[PDB]
Amino acid sequence: NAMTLLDGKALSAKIKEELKEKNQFLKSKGIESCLAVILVGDNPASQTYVKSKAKACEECGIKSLVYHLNENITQNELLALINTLNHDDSVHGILVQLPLPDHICKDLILESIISSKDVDGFHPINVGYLNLGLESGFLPCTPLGVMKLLKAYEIDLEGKDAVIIGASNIVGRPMATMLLNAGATVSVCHIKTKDLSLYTRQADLIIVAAGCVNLLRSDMVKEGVIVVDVGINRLESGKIVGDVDFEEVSKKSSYITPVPGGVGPMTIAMLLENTVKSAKNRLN
Amino acid sequence: NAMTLLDGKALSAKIKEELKEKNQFLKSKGIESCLAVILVGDNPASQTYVKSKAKACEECGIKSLVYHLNENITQNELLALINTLNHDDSVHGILVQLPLPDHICKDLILESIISSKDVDGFHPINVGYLNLGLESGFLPCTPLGVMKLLKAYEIDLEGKDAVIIGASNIVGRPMATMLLNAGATVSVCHIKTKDLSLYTRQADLIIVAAGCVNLLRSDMVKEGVIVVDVGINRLESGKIVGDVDFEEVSKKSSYITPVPGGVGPMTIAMLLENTVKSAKNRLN
Numbered sequence: 039n040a041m042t043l044l045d046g047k048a049l050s051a052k053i054k055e056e057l058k059e060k061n062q063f064l065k066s067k068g069i070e071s072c073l074a075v076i077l078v079g080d081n082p083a084s085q086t087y088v089k090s091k092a093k094a095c096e097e098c099g100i101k102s103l104v105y106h107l108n109e110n111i112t113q114n115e116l117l118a119l120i121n122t123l124n125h126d127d128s129v130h131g132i133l134v135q136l137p138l139p140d141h142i143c144k145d146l147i148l149e150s151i152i153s154s155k156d157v158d159g160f161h162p163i164n165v166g167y168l169n170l171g172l173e174s175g176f177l178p179c180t181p182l183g184v185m186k187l188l189k190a191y192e193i194d195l196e197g198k199d200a201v202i203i204g205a206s207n208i209v210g211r212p213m214a215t216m217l218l219n220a221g222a223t224v225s226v227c228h229i230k231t232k233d234l235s236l237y238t239r240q241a242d243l244i245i246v247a248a249g250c251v252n253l254l255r256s257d258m259v260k261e262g263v264i265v266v267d268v269g270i271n272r273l274e275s276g277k278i279v280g281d282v283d284f285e286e287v288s289k290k291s292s293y294i295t296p297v298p299g300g301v302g303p304m305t306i307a308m309l310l311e312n313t314v315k316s317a318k319n320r321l322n
Numbered sequence: 323n324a325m326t327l328l329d330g331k332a333l334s335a336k337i338k339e340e341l342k343e344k345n346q347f348l349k350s351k352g353i354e355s356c357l358a359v360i361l362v363g364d365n366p367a368s369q370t371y372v373k374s375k376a377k378a379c380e381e382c383g384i385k386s387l388v389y390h391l392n393e394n395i396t397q398n399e400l401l402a403l404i405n406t407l408n409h410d411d412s413v414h415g416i417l418v419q420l421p422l423p424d425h426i427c428k429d430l431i432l433e434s435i436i437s438s439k440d441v442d443g444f445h446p447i448n449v450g451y452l453n454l455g456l457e458s459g460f461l462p463c464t465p466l467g468v469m470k471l472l473k474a475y476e477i478d479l480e481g482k483d484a485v486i487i488g489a490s491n492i493v494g495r496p497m498a499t500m501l502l503n504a505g506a507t508v509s510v511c512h513i514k515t516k517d518l519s520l521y522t523r524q525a526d527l528i529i530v531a532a533g534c535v536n537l538l539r540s541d542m543v544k545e546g547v548i549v550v551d552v553g554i555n556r557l558e559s560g561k562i563v564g565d566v567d568f569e570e571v572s573k574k575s576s577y578i579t580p581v582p583g584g585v586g587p588m589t590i591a592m593l594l595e596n597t598v599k600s601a602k603n604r605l606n
């Protein structure tokens with residue numbers, strides 16, 4: 039029953055070192071990897087997350103440009119900025135920090151980012167490439183980070199029974215697609231699923247990205263399961279937990295991500311890696 | 323208990339009559355819906371399929387342009403034809419009959435079709451739109467036809483435990499995505515799945531697209547299951563069957579598609595519908 043923590047904090051640190059070296063090379067070729075981040079309005083969490091992303095860029099040799107736009111910006115004004123960034127050869131990645139204001143249509147904004155700078159992998163053509171099984175185009179950061187974490191621990195996915203809880207565009211759908219591409223059998227469950235346990239009790243691998251504290255319990259899993267917790271939930275006490283009942287589920291798991299320090303750091307690492315990927319594409 | 327045949331042949335015929343009427347009105351306003359079909363080489367099955375598509379177009383007032391190219395044409399020649407068709411305002415849909423010869427890159431050819439005439443829904447941006455749960459593209463004809471057939475019987479998909487056997491780009495992947503969009507829990511099984519029957523025995527709905535005679539047997543399903551058979555397999559005897567053991571599975575099914583006369587006719591009907599949809603878009 040020897041449980042192993044999937045230490046995304048440690049892996050993300052290793053990746054940042056790797057990127058710092060890549061960036062030294064790129065800079066010697068006259069390429070300064072650069073991520074533009076657009077933050078709209080004054081959402082407090084968003085401020086903090088963007089600051090973290092900028093700090094992570096600086097640590098690994100990526101130039102960051104943060105654009106602080108008014109909460110009342112019109113949709114066309116936001117599109118105009120993205121158009122500018124799309125044509126700026128010095129910018130390799132463009133990220134729009136979510137959530138946008140209620141009066142902005144996310145899907146239209148995201149499709150307006152040039153697909154060659156779409157480091158979140160949200161553009162419809164990048165979604166399409168991934169679903170076609172092509173995994174050289176930009177892949178979304180959170181599920182890509184999960185795949186990299188699993189690969190680092192030498193976890194073989196072929197033939198595995200995998201369950202993804204949550205069917206979001208940001209995580210659940212691309213996560214299922216990456217696992218299917220890797221040869222796993224995949225089930226995608228969500229709030230309308232009649233009985234989650236029917237699926238989870240048979241699973242070799244469970245990815246939980248459902249936004250609900252203690253959604254995954256020990257009686258819902260079999261011994262030896264690999265558990266990946268994408269959840270970030272703040273309790274009334276201020277304690278951060280995932281979507282998994284970690285204390286009990288960890289007892290039954292062969293490998294499990296802690297929260298904090300699991301998926302979270304890996305998502306940032308992949309943002310960085312995707313930006314460096316775009317920058318490297320500029321080499322002759 | 324009562325079993326009902328999901329009669330795709332009858333539904334398809336009604337759709338064709340509906341499109342013939344729509345095309346009479348379109349033609350009176352100067353638009354003649356037109357599909358270009360490109361067939362490379364002389365694969366006998368392919369020639370049969372193309373003749374079927376051309377016949378169906380004629381039945382519902384769609385003009386067909388069939389380009390029958392030599393198997394030895396270059397990738398460049400094919401691209402050049404598709405470029406011409408992309409720019410021909412009198413052509414509303416472009417379909418390339420698969421498979422292509424080995425020396426032609428399928429992915430490149432499909433992405434070269436302008437997405438607004440991509441009636442097969444294979445272009446990466448159309449795959450992306452579907453996966454994002456958007457309605458701004460073309461959807462692939464086989465899974466779309468399955469959804470239309472289910473809807474014709476008012477089959478409620480929310481919360482259903484669905485299993486899709488086969489993870490192809492033509493059927494399985496978009497099928498799973500359409501079912502997930504409709505609120506079903508979806509499992510995608512394939513050649514690397516350890517125990518297919520574990521999944522099928524619990525399913526409310528099974529879509530089979532595996533190309534294997536008698537893959538789905540009665541001991542693999544529960545009473546009341548809905549079974550959709552995308553297979554078209556020709557026996558030694560000459561009789562056409564699906565991937566389902568229809569004689570036995572039908573006894574346990576609440577709804578089941580016969581073969582022939584189930585999915586097959588609907589796939590063609592959706593091609594015609596997608597073509598007319600494109601033509602209707604071109605109105606001033």
Ligand SMILES: CN(Cc1cnc2nc(N)nc(N)c2n1)c1ccc(C(=O)N[C@@H](CCC(=O)O)C(=O)O)cc1
Binds near residue numbers: 137138144158268
């Ligand atoms: C894992 N994760 C963190 C994550 C990863 N990449 C990001 N990328 C960007 N550009 N912005 C983010 N806030 C972001 N966040 C997630 C996961 C799910 C949802 C999500 O589904 N939230 C919204 C959808 C999108 C939104 O935030 O507006 C919702 O429907 O409730 C958001 C972030």
Ligand SMILES: CN(Cc1cnc2nc(N)nc(N)c2n1)c1ccc(C(=O)N[C@@H](CCC(=O)O)C(=O)O)cc1
Binds near residue numbers: 136248
């Ligand atoms: C699990 N999940 C999706 C998700 C789905 N349904 C939900 N439902 C509820 N009620 N609450 C949620 N938080 C929730 N979350 C997540 C996971 C992480 C983050 C998150 O940390 N997002 C930060 C940004 C993180 C980043 O920038 O990468 C944000 O502000 O959106 C959001 C949603």
Ligand SMILES: Nc1nc2[nH]cnc2c(=O)[nH]1
Binds near residue numbers: 417418419463
């Ligand atoms: N173009 C094309 N479309 C399809 N839809 C279902 N099968 C096929 C095929 O072989 N080729």
Ligand SMILES: [Cl-]
Binds near residue numbers: 203227228229230
């Ligand atoms: Cl959900």
Ligand SMILES: [Cl-]
Binds near residue numbers: 301
């Ligand atoms: Cl974290």
Ligand SMILES: [Cl-]
Binds near residue numbers: 582583584586
């Ligand atoms: Cl048929």
Ligand SMILES: [K+]
Binds near residue numbers: 324325326327
């Ligand atoms: K009946």
